[PDB]
Design an enzyme around this catalytic site. Structure first.
Site, short mmCIF file in Angstrom:
data_model
loop_
_atom_site.label_atom_id
_atom_site.label_comp_id
_atom_site.label_asym_id
_atom_site.label_seq_id
_atom_site.Cartn_x
_atom_site.Cartn_y
_atom_site.Cartn_z
N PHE A 136 51.62 40.62 41.36
CA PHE A 136 51.84 41.56 42.47
C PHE A 136 51.38 40.90 43.75
CE2 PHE A 136 50.35 44.06 38.67
CZ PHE A 136 51.59 44.51 38.29
N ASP A 176 42.43 46.78 38.89
CA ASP A 176 43.89 46.71 38.92
C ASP A 176 44.56 47.80 38.09
OD1 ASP A 176 43.72 44.72 40.59
OD2 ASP A 176 44.39 43.10 39.27
N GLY A 192 48.98 36.46 40.44
CA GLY A 192 49.30 37.01 39.12
C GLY A 192 50.69 37.57 38.97
N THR A 232 48.53 37.57 45.73
CA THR A 232 47.55 36.50 45.70
C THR A 232 46.19 37.06 46.10
OG1 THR A 232 49.29 34.92 46.31
CG2 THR A 232 47.02 34.19 46.55
N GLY A 287 43.31 33.04 43.11
CA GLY A 287 44.34 33.03 42.10
C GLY A 287 45.44 34.00 42.48
N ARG A 331 41.92 39.74 31.62
CA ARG A 331 42.00 39.24 32.98
C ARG A 331 41.71 40.32 34.02
NH1 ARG A 331 47.21 39.83 31.00
NH2 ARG A 331 48.42 41.41 32.14
N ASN A 332 41.89 41.60 33.67
CA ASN A 332 41.63 42.71 34.58
C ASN A 332 40.34 43.43 34.24
OD1 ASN A 332 43.78 42.33 36.31
ND2 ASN A 332 45.17 43.61 35.10
N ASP A 366 47.78 48.24 32.89
CA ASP A 366 47.70 46.78 32.88
C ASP A 366 46.32 46.32 32.41
OD1 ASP A 366 48.48 44.17 33.07
OD2 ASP A 366 48.34 44.05 35.26
O1 LIG Z 1 43.78 46.10 45.25
C1 LIG Z 1 43.69 45.86 44.06
N1 LIG Z 1 43.06 44.65 43.68
C2 LIG Z 1 42.46 43.65 44.44
N2 LIG Z 1 42.02 42.48 43.98
C3 LIG Z 1 41.41 41.68 44.97
C4 LIG Z 1 41.36 42.22 46.21
S1 LIG Z 1 42.08 43.76 46.18
C5 LIG Z 1 44.31 46.99 43.18
C6 LIG Z 1 43.15 47.89 42.69
C7 LIG Z 1 41.85 47.54 43.05
C8 LIG Z 1 40.80 48.30 42.63
F1 LIG Z 1 39.51 47.88 43.04
C9 LIG Z 1 40.87 49.42 41.87
C10 LIG Z 1 42.15 49.78 41.49
C11 LIG Z 1 43.27 49.06 41.87
O2 LIG Z 1 44.50 49.44 41.49
N3 LIG Z 1 45.46 47.73 43.81
C12 LIG Z 1 45.33 48.94 44.68
C13 LIG Z 1 46.74 49.39 45.08
C14 LIG Z 1 47.20 50.45 45.88
C15 LIG Z 1 48.57 50.65 46.11
C16 LIG Z 1 49.53 49.78 45.56
C17 LIG Z 1 51.04 49.97 45.78
C18 LIG Z 1 51.68 51.21 45.71
C19 LIG Z 1 53.07 51.37 45.90
C20 LIG Z 1 53.91 50.28 46.15
N4 LIG Z 1 55.38 50.38 46.35
C21 LIG Z 1 56.15 51.46 45.72
C22 LIG Z 1 57.61 51.11 45.42
N5 LIG Z 1 58.13 50.13 46.36
C23 LIG Z 1 57.52 50.31 47.69
C24 LIG Z 1 55.98 50.19 47.69
C25 LIG Z 1 53.27 49.02 46.20
C26 LIG Z 1 51.88 48.88 46.01
C27 LIG Z 1 49.04 48.72 44.76
C28 LIG Z 1 47.66 48.51 44.52
C29 LIG Z 1 46.83 47.48 43.74
O3 LIG Z 1 47.24 46.53 43.09
N1 LIG Z 2 37.35 41.26 43.30
C1 LIG Z 2 37.65 40.08 42.75
N2 LIG Z 2 36.74 39.08 42.83
C2 LIG Z 2 37.04 37.90 42.28
N3 LIG Z 2 38.14 37.53 41.63
C3 LIG Z 2 39.02 38.53 41.57
C4 LIG Z 2 38.86 39.81 42.08
N4 LIG Z 2 39.98 40.59 41.82
C5 LIG Z 2 40.77 39.78 41.17
N5 LIG Z 2 40.26 38.53 40.98
C6 LIG Z 2 40.88 37.39 40.29
O1 LIG Z 2 41.85 36.81 41.13
C7 LIG Z 2 42.86 36.19 40.31
C8 LIG Z 2 44.23 36.64 40.76
O2 LIG Z 2 44.30 38.09 40.74
P1 LIG Z 2 45.55 38.80 40.07
O3 LIG Z 2 46.71 38.66 40.98
O4 LIG Z 2 45.25 40.24 39.64
O5 LIG Z 2 45.74 37.93 38.76
P2 LIG Z 2 45.62 38.55 37.34
O6 LIG Z 2 44.62 39.66 37.36
O7 LIG Z 2 45.12 37.47 36.34
N6 LIG Z 2 47.14 39.10 36.89
P3 LIG Z 2 47.24 40.79 36.69
O8 LIG Z 2 47.54 41.11 35.17
O9 LIG Z 2 48.37 41.32 37.51
O10 LIG Z 2 45.90 41.49 37.12
C9 LIG Z 2 42.50 36.51 38.86
O11 LIG Z 2 41.76 35.44 38.27
C10 LIG Z 2 41.62 37.75 39.01
O12 LIG Z 2 40.72 37.92 37.92
MG LIG Z 3 44.13 41.52 38.29
#
Ligand SMILES: O=C(Nc1nccs1)[C@@H](c1cc(F)ccc1O)N1Cc2ccc(-c3ccc(N4CCNCC4)cc3)cc2C1=O
Ligand SMILES: Nc1ncnc2c1ncn2[C@@H]1O[C@H](COP(=O)(O)OP(=O)(O)NP(=O)(O)O)[C@@H](O)[C@H]1O
Ligand SMILES: [Mg+2]
Ligand SMILES: O=C(Nc1nccs1)[C@@H](c1cc(F)ccc1O)N1Cc2ccc(-c3ccc(N4CCNCC4)cc3)cc2C1=O
Ligand SMILES: *CCC(=O)N[C@@H]1CN(c2nc(Nc3cn(C)nc3OC)c3ncn(C)c3n2)C[C@H]1F
Lengths: 294, 293
Positions: free
Chosen positions: A24, A156, A22, A26, A20, A142-143, A138
């Protein structure tokens, strides 16, 4: 500290399937291939939609180190990162997905004990973030990721540098004020999502008009399954004075009390034919999927 | 106690791929589908070959309950059982597989620190089984599973109800299985690792092993072992079982050598192989190995 974030090479992981997207980036189901090994380990990969620079990567890494440093059973930890043109972040893959889609798909099979315990666990995760002085910014259904049906974890968080108007406190919508008490507002909305089995907040109201209705005193309505006890808690999270809202420490205590007598506080059709898993089924889940302390 | 072994239905799990064969059955890779859920969780399933009856299924359950009761980082726990025509046993899937094939496949990339720590961890698990008064009876490199390259766990223990070349002399001659006869098998298991997975007594018929042992022949010194390591192996193969070391003592000695591994193992290329950094270990544990120690 620095050792809690693994820097990965492009060549040691592969994106295999889109899960999916959202706001920031994919999210993909991926595979990590350790160097010199033959195994393939599933991971979740978020590829940021906007490309960045080496200097912007310094910003990314500084925040990445903080999110790689969390240690709480109900808070997801950032595990790794791979920098290029586009930034790819790595964390544990949660096969159950997010709690929002989980409650929508299981809405006819979720009893009061699950719902209230999820509320406790989210408050436990949020209280940890406040203790670490990390504002989520946030929080939403969903998070919240489902590790097992009995164990949810917050994800997130802390994306200060990187809007969910209908989850934001009034002081965040107007003046861009983000505190632990504005998170408490987001917590209230998230609880509303769970208790409505995944309804959309302020359905059909344009985001640009949400702050107007909040100032005039309108709030999300009482979900059909909520007793007045639960709805009072949700409403207190949406008080205009941020210091008058409950604290996550108090929310843990109050929801834990209700979880010890769940049918007193949630009125769900079919509640007596659904329960928590037996100790047998919980031990099986934890041994296969959930070996962390709690 | 009873809640540590889950009784599964046929309809809530599926065998998907054959992984190999073990004691009393074929071990398959499987998927668990929780009732009312949509996820598929990988498991390892062994379907017993000689089929059983409901009254005989009681004997199985009594031993299964004990193997579901182990709680040690270096000992595998039985998680579930499905009582069908053929009885299927369920436990955690180890994608890295067994330590025997692992050492064979990575033999040109395994340094002294890994080898000595593997010896420590197996001894910790065996000391645990002794504390629980559980004799393994089939310890071998094949029955040590790799959870991560840094974390191995003992499996398939306690099957009292033959691996001649791993057995102590008193087991071959008299069917005596004790914690001290396990120490013999542990010595052979270490020999397998240090030789990078060689076959013990290669080409000698099993029917002649007890004879060569009585005359004093033992497995030869592996090329990478210093005498300090080989003396330990030889002490595990003493004819007097009470003269062999105790698992508590093996833990201490191998841990000492693990603190200066290049003093005790001479491996070509050892200075270009190390343990994972704390960075790489934290990554492994968060993804695959969230258990304590
Ligand atoms: O990776 C995350 N999600 C995932 N889903 C699935 C697989 S990975 C979460 C996340 C995952 C967790 F497990 C726990 C906390 C968390 O926050 N992150 C981590 C993260 C680190 C850094 C940044 C970051 C910092 C600065 C900038 N800018 C600043 C202004 N302009 C230039 C650049 C852009 C992006 C974003 C995130 C983020 O979105
Ligand atoms: N570690 C993970 N394992 C499985 N699904 C995940 C994981 N992290 C995120 N997702 C899912 O992946 C999809 C897309 O992630 P994301 O871009 O964060 O969408 P979102 O969480 O619904 N929007 P946002 O409010 O920004 O977090 C969503 O359905 C998330 O719940
Ligand atoms: Mg999310
Ligand atoms: O399941 C195991 N391996 C696995 N590979 C892959 C997936 S599961 C290990 C195992 C797993 C552990 F986690 C720990 C120890 C252990 O030994 N078991 C467990 C087990 C239980 C019972 C029996 C058993 C006992 C008695 C009889 N008799 C009774 C009298 N009439 C004739 C037949 C038949 C079968 C065998 C085993 C066994 O082989
Ligand atoms: C090394 C000797 C051997 O092959 N023994 C067979 C297989 N065993 C086994 N293997 C695994 N994991 C595994 C092996 N392969 C080739 N792929 C995988 O993972 C996909 C395993 N996980 C849990 N258990 C109990 C396992 N056993 C034991 C004998 F079947």
């Amino acid at each position: 500290n620095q050792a809690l974030l693994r820097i990965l090479k492009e060549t040691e992981f592969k994106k295999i399937k889109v899960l999916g997207s959202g706001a920031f980036g994919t999210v993909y189901k991926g595979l990590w291939i350790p160097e010199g090994e033959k195994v393939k380990i599933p991971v979740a990969i978020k590829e940021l939609r906007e490309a960045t620079s080496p200097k912007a990567n310094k910003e990314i890494l500084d925040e990445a180190y903080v999110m790689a440093s969390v240690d709480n059973p109900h808070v997801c930890r950032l595990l790794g990162i791979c920098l290029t043109s586009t930034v790819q972040l790595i964390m544990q893959l949660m096969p159950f997905g997010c709690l929002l889609d989980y409650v929508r798909e299981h809405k006819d099979n979720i009893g009061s004990q699950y719902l209230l315990n999820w509320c406790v666990q989210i408050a436990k995760g949020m209280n940890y973030l406040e203790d670490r002085r990390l504002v989520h910014r946030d929080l939403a259904a969903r998070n919240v990721l489902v590790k097992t049906p009995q164990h949810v974890k917050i994800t997130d968080f802390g994306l200060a540098k990187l809007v969910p108007i209908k989850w934001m406190a009034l002081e965040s919508i107007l003046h861009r004020i983000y505190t632990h008490q504005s998170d408490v507002w987001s917590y209230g909305v998230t609880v509303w999502e769970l208790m409505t089995f995944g309804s959309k907040p302020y359905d059909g109201i344009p985001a640009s008009e949400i702050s107007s209705i909040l100032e005039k005193g309108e709030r999300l309505p009482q979900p059909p399954i909520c007793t007045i006890d639960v709805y009072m808690i949700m409403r207190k999270c949406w008080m205009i004075d941020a210091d008058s809202r409950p604290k996550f420490r108090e929310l843990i205590i109050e929801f834990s009390k209700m979880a010890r007598d769940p049918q007193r506080y949630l009125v769900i059709q079919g509640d007596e034919r659904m329960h928590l898993p037996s100790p047998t089924d919980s031990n099986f889940y934890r041994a296969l999927m959930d070996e962390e302390d709690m």
